[PDB]
């Protein structure tokens, strides 16, 4: 008789930017 | 008794009729989501079927923000159905859903 249905999902991803991780050090 | 192709067409039309060709405007969007809901609901109820309908509409302003939705049911898989439509234009995202349950 009664059962579950599919899990409908929608996805609107956030904008992304290319990034980097740098290090610095005084001499 | 629930034809997905039928409702999908109604949804899309309701979207276009209401927000198709306009840009996001805070104090106008609340009026729009309501119309889309009434529009879809009006069309669906004419054909007086022994079905119950649930209609939800949401409009988000495109702003690089993330958005995720999920849904499911505990109904009669042989009779009850549903249709979710993604939509978008230059300024906003729209998601409308319709669910149909007999009895």
């Amino acid at each position: 008789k009664l059962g579950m249905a599919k899990i409908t999902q929608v996805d609107f991803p956030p904008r992304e930017i290319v990034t980097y991780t740098k290090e610095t050090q005084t001499p | 008794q629930f034809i997905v192709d039928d409702v999908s067409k109604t949804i899309k039309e309701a979207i276009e009729t209401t927000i198709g060709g306009n840009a996001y405007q805070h104090d106008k969007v609340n009026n729009w989501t309501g119309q889309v809901v009434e529009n879809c609901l009006t069309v669906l109820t004419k054909e007086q079927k022994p079905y119950k309908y649930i209609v939800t509409a949401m409009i988000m302003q495109k702003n690089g923000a993330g958005l995720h939705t999920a849904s499911s049911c505990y109904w009669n898989n042989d009779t009850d159905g549903s249709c979710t439509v993604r939509w978008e234009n230059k300024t906003m995202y729209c998601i409308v859903s319709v669910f149909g349950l007999a009895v």
Partner: protein, 85 residues
């Protein structure tokens, strides 16, 4: 004398950086204010959000957007100016 130790930005933007730094150095003596001057020019001419660290002795590990980073020395002073919205 300007010394670009580690950079990742438009050749034009690098120059722009060094210029602004020089001017900053001859308007303020406090590092804190030196930074402010620089950071504000880049938020203005290149959009937010920029961050600047001006000192003579410090180590760091930061994250940034591509093409928006530079670590150059201007004399004995070290300047760290990167963008990370």
């Amino acid at each position: 004398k300007a010394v670009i130790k580690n950079a990742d930005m438009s050749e034009e933007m690098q120059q722009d950086a060094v210029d602004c730094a020089t001017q900053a150095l001859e308007k303020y003596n406090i590092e804190k204010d030196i930074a402010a001057y620089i950071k504000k020019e880049f938020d203005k001419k290149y959009n937010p959000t920029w961050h600047c660290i001006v000192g003579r002795n410090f180590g760091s590990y930061v994250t940034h957007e591509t093409r928006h980073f530079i670590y150059f020395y201007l004399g004995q002073v070290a300047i760290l100016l990167f963008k990370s919205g």
